[PDB]
Amino acid sequence: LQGATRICTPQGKGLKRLSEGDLAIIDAPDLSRTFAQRLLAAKPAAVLNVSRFTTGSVPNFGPQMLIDGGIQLVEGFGQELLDGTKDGKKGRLTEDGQLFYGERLISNGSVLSGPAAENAFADAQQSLLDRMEAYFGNTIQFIHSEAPLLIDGLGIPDTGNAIEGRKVLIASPGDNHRSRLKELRSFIREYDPVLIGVDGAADTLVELGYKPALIVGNPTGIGADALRSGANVILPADPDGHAVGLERIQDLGIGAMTFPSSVNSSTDLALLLADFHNPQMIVNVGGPVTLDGVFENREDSDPAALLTRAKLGTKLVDGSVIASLYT
Amino acid sequence: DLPGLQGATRICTPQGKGLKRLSEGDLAIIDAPDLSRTFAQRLLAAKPAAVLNVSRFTTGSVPNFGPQMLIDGGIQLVEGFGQELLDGTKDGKKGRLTEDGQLFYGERLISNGSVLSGPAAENAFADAQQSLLDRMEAYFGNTIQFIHSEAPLLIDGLGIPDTGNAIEGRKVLIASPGDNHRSRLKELRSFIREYDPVLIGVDGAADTLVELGYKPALIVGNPTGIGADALRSGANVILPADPDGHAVGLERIQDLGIGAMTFPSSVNSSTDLALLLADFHNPQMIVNVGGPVTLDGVFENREDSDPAALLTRAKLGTKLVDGSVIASLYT
Numbered sequence: 001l002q003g004a005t006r007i008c009t010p011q012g013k014g015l016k017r018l019s020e021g022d023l024a025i026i027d028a029p030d031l032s033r034t035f036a037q038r039l040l041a042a043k044p045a046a047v048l049n050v051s052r053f054t055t056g057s058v059p060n061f062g063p064q065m066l067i068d069g070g071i072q073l074v075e076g077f078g079q080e081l082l083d084g085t086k087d088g089k090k091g092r093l094t095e096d097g098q099l100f101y102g103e104r105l106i107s108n109g110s111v112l113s114g115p116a117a118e119n120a121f122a123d124a125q126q127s128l129l130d131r132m133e134a135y136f137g138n139t140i141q142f143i144h145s146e147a148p149l150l151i152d153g154l155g156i157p158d159t160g161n162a163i164e165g166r167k168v169l170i171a172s173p174g175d176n177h178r179s180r181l182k183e184l185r186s187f188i189r190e191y192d193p194v195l196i197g198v199d200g201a202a203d204t205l206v207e208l209g210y211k212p213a214l215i216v217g218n219p220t221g222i223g224a225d226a227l228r229s230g231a232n233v234i235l236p237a238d239p240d241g242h243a244v245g246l247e248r249i250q251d252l253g254i255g256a257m258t259f260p261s262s263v264n265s266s267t268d269l270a271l272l273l274a275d276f277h278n279p280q281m282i283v284n285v286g287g288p289v290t291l292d293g294v295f296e297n298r299e300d301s302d303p304a305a306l307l308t309r310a311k312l313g314t315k316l317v318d319g320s321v322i323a324s325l326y327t
Numbered sequence: 328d329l330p331g332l333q334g335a336t337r338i339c340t341p342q343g344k345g346l347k348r349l350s351e352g353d354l355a356i357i358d359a360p361d362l363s364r365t366f367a368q369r370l371l372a373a374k375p376a377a378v379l380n381v382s383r384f385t386t387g388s389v390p391n392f393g394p395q396m397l398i399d400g401g402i403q404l405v406e407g408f409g410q411e412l413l414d415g416t417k418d419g420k421k422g423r424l425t426e427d428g429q430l431f432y433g434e435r436l437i438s439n440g441s442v443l444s445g446p447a448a449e450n451a452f453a454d455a456q457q458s459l460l461d462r463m464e465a466y467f468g469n470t471i472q473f474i475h476s477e478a479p480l481l482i483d484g485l486g487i488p489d490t491g492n493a494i495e496g497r498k499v500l501i502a503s504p505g506d507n508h509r510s511r512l513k514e515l516r517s518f519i520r521e522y523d524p525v526l527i528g529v530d531g532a533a534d535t536l537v538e539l540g541y542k543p544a545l546i547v548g549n550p551t552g553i554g555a556d557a558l559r560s561g562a563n564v565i566l567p568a569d570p571d572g573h574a575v576g577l578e579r580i581q582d583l584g585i586g587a588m589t590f591p592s593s594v595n596s597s598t599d600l601a602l603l604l605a606d607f608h609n610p611q612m613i614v615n616v617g618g619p620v621t622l623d624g625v626f627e628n629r630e631d632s633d634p635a636a637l638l639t640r641a642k643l644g645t646k647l648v649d650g651s652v653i654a655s656l657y658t
Contacts, residue, residue, distance in 0.1 A: 033484055034484070058482045059478055059479075059482060061483050061485070062483070125478065128474070128478060128482075129474075129475050132471050132474050132475070133471055136467040136468075136470050136471050137467075139463075139467055140460070140463050140464055140467050143459070143463050144456075144459075144460050144463070147390050147456065147459060148390075150622075151390060151391060152363070152364040152392050152393070153364055153365070154364065154392065167655070191656075281652045288644070288645050289644075290645060291481075291638065291641035291642045291644060292642070293644075294641075295481075295482070309641070310621065310622035310625075310637060310641070311621075311622045311623070313619065313620075313622065313623065313624075313649075314619045314621065314649035314651055315649075315652070317648045317649075318644075318645035318646075318648075320645055321612050321645065321646070321648045324498070324612055325656070
């Protein structure tokens with residue numbers, strides 16, 4: 001198959017130039033229906049993917065739509081497909097999945113046939129059902145054994161009257177939490193929310209010049225400057241009351257409270273603690289948890305994370321939503 | 328003297344002046360169904376002789392430990408007095424509570440209550456704990472079934488109509504006809520003016536948007552329940568349809584000669600359809616006004632809750648913000 005080699009992204013890179021009969025170069029694992037529809041409307045001879053069209057986690061119909069439209073599908077070329085592509089140059093794709101610029105080999109891919117794409121979809125369909133049966137089975141078990149915490153707030157320490165009626169901002173050490181905190185500088189200055197630092201993000205808050213009211217996490221993994229900043233330290237403890245890191249708190253001579261529970265995440269503990277104190281709102285920075293993340297996780301996801309987000313209900317807002325008000 | 332516990336009758340609320348002056352040995356009068364641990368802790372610290380509830384301490388939907396904390400503290404619990412307890416109470420007047428749960432002001436009967444013993448409160452807790460497990464087994468069993476049969480919608484957006492490029496990258500505000508949605512929309516006047524979000528009116532809230540002087544880009548719902556002014560405003564009308572494509576209210580749209588699209592699905596709520604439609608078009612954010620759905624609502628329901636509602640909120644993830652959060656930025 002001979003045609004122009006056009007690099008396409010779901011955001012609209014080469015979709016406007018993609019003509020009938022050319023070779024589309026994409027990097028789209030788990031190809032979305034929207035991107036497949038845009039590719040299908042352009043009528044390309046073949047879609048060459050750097051990654052796999054169906055990775056196996058979710059049943060995505062996109063690759064089958066392309067095959068039904070008479071488009072050749074070749075996948076798993078790898079980064080060398082993007083590194084060796086000249087946008088617009090007439091390429092040549094063989095029936096074996098090889099891409100050439102005349103007689104020069106650029107990349108080797110794996111041809112995805114119609115029946116193989118149907119099988120991958122059916123396998124992903126069964127995989128999602130099995131993972132969701134396990135996940136929501138664990139959700140029922142979690143609610144049953146942790147109802148004292150979810151319903152009564154058993155174990156949640158009383159941190160005083162500082163949170164009630166106020167805006168709260170919780171910072172967790174997720175990817176790019178520091179740059180999100182910097183985008184929220186005007187928000188923090190203008191609204192003066194109660195700051196809660198979780199684990200290593202308590203260090204980040206203190207390094208940015210803040211004085212968090214609360215710090216949540218095992219003090220073993222929190223810096224000395226954050227622990228000595230004046231914040232009330234909330235230590236996760238086993239349901240029996242044993243708190244790891246209490247010796248460090250006692251060595252420092254600082255005030256601390258324990259939060260006995262079976263919840264492993266200190267971000268979920270901080271969210272449940274803030275909610276229990278009846279705030280006006282809770283801005284969650286560096287701790288995002290979504291349904292799509294649960295569906296795409298090939299490993300077991302913790303039901304306590306999605307249940308905590310649902311428990312906070314209408315009071316929860318992600319830091320990215322607030323930062324978009326300042327863009 | 329006449330038998331029973333004698334003490335001053337004081338009306339207490341989970342956030343009132345009654346607690347701040349509730350003294351040791353008083354008969355606390357409350358109206359707290361499913362008594363919270365926080366309110367039980369504040370009542371316990373005051374050391375009243377008895378706590379008299381208008382409602383039941385444990386109604387049976389959730390396992391609440393509060394009543395047992397009071398009983399462990401040596402407080403007599405009497406419940407189910409009804410509104411006549413609040414109507415017949417005089418704050419600070421010395422009342423008499425018999426072992427049978429009767430409240431008197433001397434020899435005059437005010438109200439009859441049911442004595443809640445420690446073992447009966449433990450049994451009510453254990454029963455509410457089993458009823459909650461049964462409901463959650465039913466609820467999350469339906470959630471698994473929903474994900475399996477509706478994966479083309481949740482994963483691929485199958486059935487979601489293409490409304491054009493107006494939503495992508497923009498802030499979106501969806502209005503549903505929940506309680507006080509009009510007064511929430513009025514509190515968001517500065518937000519709408521300052522940020523110019525894409526407006527989506529759901530059902531009767533499309534009428535509210537048009538009455539407030541707005542021109543919603545989209546209207547979602549059965550046109551049978553939407554006003555003529557909203558349907559003729561210039562908005563693209565999205566009709567909920569059965570999985571087979573049958574849309575109720577299509578005859579009305581065709582009589583008006585206006586543009587419309589259908590959204591075939593097994594989701595019953597037009598608010599969930601509007602949220603799934605907005606999310607599929609990749610917005611910057613989705614401000615949700617008049618349609619709140621929470622986990623506490625699922626726990627408290629007792630009737631069957633729709634898993635599609637909570638799954639929709641989780642599907643939108645980090646892009647979802649309640650209108651009350653945005654309105655708090657203007658207070």
